[PDB]
Amino acid sequence: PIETVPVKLKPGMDGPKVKQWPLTEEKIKALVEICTEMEKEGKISKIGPENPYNTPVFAIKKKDSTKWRKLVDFRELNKRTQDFWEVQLGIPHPAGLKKKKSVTVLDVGDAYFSVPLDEDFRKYTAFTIPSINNETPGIRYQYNVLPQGWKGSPAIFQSSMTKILEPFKKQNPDIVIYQYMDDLYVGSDLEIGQHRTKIEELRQHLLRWGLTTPGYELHPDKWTVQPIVLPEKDSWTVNDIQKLVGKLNWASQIYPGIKVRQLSKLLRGTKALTEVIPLTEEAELELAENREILKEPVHGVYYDPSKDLIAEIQKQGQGQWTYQIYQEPFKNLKTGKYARMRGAHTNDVKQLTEAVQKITTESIVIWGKTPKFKLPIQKETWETWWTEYWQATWIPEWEFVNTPPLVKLWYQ
Amino acid sequence: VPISPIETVPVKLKPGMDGPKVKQWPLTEEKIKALVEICTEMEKEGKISKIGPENPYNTPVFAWRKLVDFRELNKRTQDFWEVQLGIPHPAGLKKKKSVTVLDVGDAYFSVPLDEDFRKYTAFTIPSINNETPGIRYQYNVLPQGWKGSPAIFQSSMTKILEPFKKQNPDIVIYQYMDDLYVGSDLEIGQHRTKIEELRQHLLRWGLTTPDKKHQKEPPFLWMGYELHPDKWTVQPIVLPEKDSWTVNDIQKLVGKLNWASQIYPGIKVRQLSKLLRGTKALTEVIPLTEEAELELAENREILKEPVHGVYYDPSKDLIAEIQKQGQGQWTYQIYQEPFKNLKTGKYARMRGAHTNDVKQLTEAVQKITTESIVIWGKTPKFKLPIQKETWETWWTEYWQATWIPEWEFVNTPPLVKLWYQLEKEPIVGAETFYVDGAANRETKLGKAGYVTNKGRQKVVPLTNTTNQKTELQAIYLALQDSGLEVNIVTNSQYALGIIQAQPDKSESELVNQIIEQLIKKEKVYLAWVPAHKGIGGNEQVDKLVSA
DNA sequence: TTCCCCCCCTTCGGTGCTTTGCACCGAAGGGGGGG
Ligand SMILES: Cc1cc(/C=C/C#N)cc(C)c1Nc1ccnc(Nc2ccc(C#N)cc2)n1
Questions:
Q1: Which chain A residues touch B530 with a CB distance below 8 Å?
Q2: Which of A112, A298, A319, B534 is the most buried (most CB within 10 A)?
């Protein structure tokens, strides 16, 4: 056989020259085993010292699967080939995927093994396996077939994927289809049993068409931008009204109609924090009006595809987190919270990894454009430990934050 | 027609450029006229062959034997991939029974160049003592002094050696400088057979490896270490004892101590490095203080007695222990068996202006974990001098996420504990101060004060201070004249960001005084309110400081 | 008189924010072990 699509970087830009982080001994043994197995089938080809490019490589696992899997950080090669996949062979993003009751995720990675990569491009997708203590030189390879985790791989394989999925789209026009990286999101309004049967039908259809394949449901109908609610107290003290005034001052930036001038009528003196204050009726009326404001939609909020989504994560203790996906500061496109799981005591970085995966999957479903994370964690700890509990086929873009968070205004 | 026993590696150039021309440079010392004779010998042995008028080249003679300088050409050569960038550390080396060194100096001229690229490495200079116009020249093998020659030679050597490494992995082969070191668990009775087989294998591919000197010479003195059969040390450390120390001398001493701190336990250089703050001239002599002299003598005390690390074993697991040293210094020992260390190290980086001890332990376990991953591949079992309850109380209430690998408590004081903890609820029976501090940018004058609920008021002036420091001093005033149980209200969240983190040491003495006061107290509660709203007594104290 | 890698400790500078100060951070020069 078939013609190879000419993939070229933008003029005036070089290729990826990123180094690779040291790996654990088992993540090197399994990596070598998998790479030799892929070498026996002509999927990767060893390269000589005339290829000055490199991309980082990690090893991960999958849920309910002891077998390891390889992963290549194409976060820079994706940026370099900005024009190719985005402009020439872009993928439309439906605006109705949100309304589906259930969304299931499937893997189409092995369908990418068939198409070989362009001859002129094979040098850019070069990676190396390191050695324990650097005693021996790292074993270098390059991709022969189309590579997983690269932006241009779906852009090139969409022509065949449309022919794969046309009969199912025609026979079942009540199911929406979306593709991002090697992930296929299928949206439907059916019930659990019918959805599972239809997913099995899709799996067997893909197997029959030629795909090699060796719960998992998400419900967008259970997602809602969380609103902020003012505290409710049977007994009101000076400390509580001070906290409420501070919270309303903080929230007045979000809502221009927030008023706190009547709240100061109860704090005209240097009263002690512990002592109680009876509540005046004007203050109660304004407090109820502010509560009513805190349910209205934010005025001036719109989604502009030109800019990039910015995510944030705040740890609220007890193994609980909050997040706010937004573009302009204090103008939240989406908010939410995340809680513990079946594990009694597992980890703190692992919970952050799961929260990041959930946030980015929801951002793909809602918008299709992955945000950038302001992760509240040490850079060294994250870089050292993220791979141990990360189960995904792609990597977001995160910048770490070193500021004092005084945000107790998200979880009570 | 030329010959080639191994595969050639294609090389390109940066597009749009051609071959340069270089001015004459002085020749070597041991040869001044023998260049033509050695060129004739090279042409006889096939490394060099004459050509026609290919393209304008002009290259000098380097200032051993003749060496052609391609420095101007090296700016036209394709970029290559460097093979070895991180040197192995001796601790992560397995214990070999015997070692043997072979010479591969001449084998560097036995890797054929690219047939398409041979026409670029051409020498175009005649003799010096005689009178000749000039002969032709081009390399049929890897040139010396080329940008890409070392990488190509290393790749070819690895390709040649890999078939032998496949059959018998027990023998390890390393290529440093221009030799080959072979280590094996076989005794000398059978080591020679393997050495002979390796030599025959290298000869089959066209390389001869004769060497006699270092086959019986351990230690090996490699990169600054003293590798023996089953131990390793550092090369001997020289400590200057000159009475007068300049800035450069202190820098040299602290660098040498940092290098020597990898095998000698309990080396502290934190006090010495402080002497270099604010001084940059090497001709300025900095007088020595008491703490610096004491720590310098302490460092000298370890180095007289020699100790040797042991070689790693992959059949066991490694344990890392951390000990405190005060002022923010930590020392760790990594060993696979007690009293037989694999490595030692120190950590003293001051990450941030305001930090405490538990955060330092968190930042110190990370370094050990990363170093173990780089060197040994497995994370070690930590044995920290901290209590699990303190760790939980700190990490469940801190905003930053963090993790520690499997670690066990060991009782060896000084233990690491959080000195003071605030209260989350207002105290019953505690006077509620309302503090404020104001400053002026023009007059550089400020006023810090507080008003209590009982009616007590206090204001103090300050000079050459900013608003943040005025507010911190107002909190200081609130803490000074108060009971054990204290409630405070401040309208600035910067002091809240400082105090709430609960630091143990700071680079500003005011915060140090604040912790010194908060240690004596029993229960402290700090609250934040927005200013400019006349909330509580904040308006009164704001008026007092502003008027 | 090179240049680069690795490591460490200050100094410096521009962001991010608590706002012409203050905190955090990376990268620049010096000091070590070699080519
Ligand atoms: C880094 C390294 C440096 C030299 C030395 C280079 C130089 N000069 C020699 C060898 C063979 C190696 N490579 C390896 C690999 C695995 N285990 C070991 N252990 C080991 C190291 C030194 C001695 C000795 N004597 C014995 C065993 N060395």
A1: 245-246, 249
A2: A112
CA of B62 to C1' of C4 (A): 21
Structure tokens at B178: 């221009």
On the CB side of A200, how many CA atoms lie within 13 Å of its CA? Answer: 5
User: Is B400's CB within 8 Å of A314's CB?
Assistant: no
Q: Protein footprint on strand C: which nucleotides are under 7 Å from a CB?
A: 5-11, 16-19, 21-26, 30-35
Please work out whether the CB of residue A134 comes within 6 Å of at least one atom of ligand 1. Answer: no
* Tokens 């022919």, located at residue: A163
- Pairwise CA distance, residues B434 & B355, whole Å: 27
For residue B152, report the distance from its CA to the centre of ligand 1, in Å.
23
What the block records as the tokens of A56 is 């980082």
- R_g of chain B, CA atoms, integer Å: 35
DSSP letter for A84, please.
I
Q: What is the resolution of this structure in A?
A: 3.4
Query: Which atom of ligand 1 is nearest to B222's Cα?
Result: 8
A120 phi/psi in degrees, rounded to 5: -70, -15
Q: How distant, in Å, are the alpha carbons of A47, A293, B329, B339, B471 from that of A289?
A: 69, 6, 56, 72, 35
Cβ of B83 < 7 Å from strand C? no
How far is B146 from A365, CA to CA, in rounded Å?
54
Under 8 Å between Cβ of B478 and B448: no
Interface test with A, best of B12, B95, B399 (most A CBs within 10 A): B399
Going by DSSP bridges, is the β-strand pair A310-317/A331-338 parallel, antiparallel, or unpaired? unpaired
Q: Is A384–B496 a contact, with Cβ atoms under 8 angstroms apart? A: no
Packing angle, helices B467-480 and B509-520, rounded to 10: 20
CA distance A380 to B362: 11
- SS in 3 state form for B388-440? HHHHHHHHCCCCCECCCCCECCCCCCCCECCCCCCCCCCCCCCCEEEEEEEEC
As separate numbers, helices (DSSP H) first and strands (DSSP E) second, chain B gives 12, 14
Residue A323: closest CA among A340, A342, A339: A339
> Which positions ≥6 away from B485 have C-beta within 8 Å?
B427, B429, B430, B521, B522, B523
State which approach was used to obtain the coordinates: cryo-EM
Cα(A116)–Cα(A326) distance, rounded to whole angstroms?
Answer: 39
Q: Is A304 annotated as a binding residue?
A: no
Whole-number Å distance between alpha carbons of B346 and B325 = 10
**Helix or strand or coil: residue B541?**
helix
Alpha-carbon distance of A194 to A188, in angstroms, equals 10
Beginning with the edge strand found earlier in the chain, give each strand of the sheet holding B457-463 in spatial order: B457-463, B445-451, B432-439, B485-490, B523-528
- Alpha-carbon gap, residue B266 to B247, rounded angstroms: 24
> HSE (CB half, 13 Å, CA atoms) of A381?
23
Q: How far is the CA of B333 from the C1' of C27 (A)?
A: 31
DSSP A265-306: GG-SS---SSSB-PPPHHHHHHHHHHHHHTTSPPTT----TT
- State the Cα torsion B259-B263-B267-B272 to the nearest 10°: -10
Could you tell me how far CA B173 lies from the centroid of its own chain? 27
Interhelix angle B467-480/B493-500, rounded to 10 degrees, is 60
B276 CB contact with strand C at below 7 Å: yes
Question: Is residue B483 within 8 Å of B464, Cβ to Cβ?
Answer: no
Q: What share of chain B is helix, strand, coil (3-state, %, to 5)?
A: 30, 20, 50
Structure-token pair, residue A251: 């929230």
CA–CA gap between residue B475 and residue B493 (Å, rounded): 12
What is the C-alpha separation between B138 and B121, in angstroms, rounded?
6
